[PDB]
């Protein structure tokens, strides 16, 4: 069994550049920046599929 990727998901090649240190609510969280939207996501929760 290989789970299919669900219809809404977006392909993203891993690259060191996608992850960074950043301030977020008095913490230096490992922010991830989505390559399409450009949006930064300090929490692992709430990230785009």
């Amino acid at each position: 069994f290989v789970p299919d990727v669900p219809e809404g998901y977006v392909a993203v090649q891993y690259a060191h550049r996608l992850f960074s240190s950043s301030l977020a609510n008095k913490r230096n969280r490992v922010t991830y920046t989505h390559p399409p939207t450009g949006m930064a996501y300090p929490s692992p929760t709430g990230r785009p599929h």
């Binding site: 240190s21 950043s22 301030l23 008095k26 913490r27 230096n28 969280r29 490992v30 929490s43 692992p44 929760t45």
Partner: protein, 50 residues
């Protein structure tokens, strides 16, 4: 102190839980060059009222 969701769910009515809450307004800001720490604080139980 901490309150298990298990006790919130299984205690008889009439029990008086004692929840604690942080006022994080005065929490220190991280140094600009300190590497990020892994992990994430989460809260499960919330007030319904002020």
């Amino acid at each position: 102190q901490h309150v298990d969701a298990e006790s919130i769910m299984t205690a008889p009515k009439g029990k008086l839980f004692h929840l604690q809450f942080m006022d994080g307004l005065l929490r220190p800001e991280p140094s600009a060059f300190d590497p990020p720490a892994s992990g994430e604080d989460m809260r499960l139980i919330y007030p319904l009222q002020p």
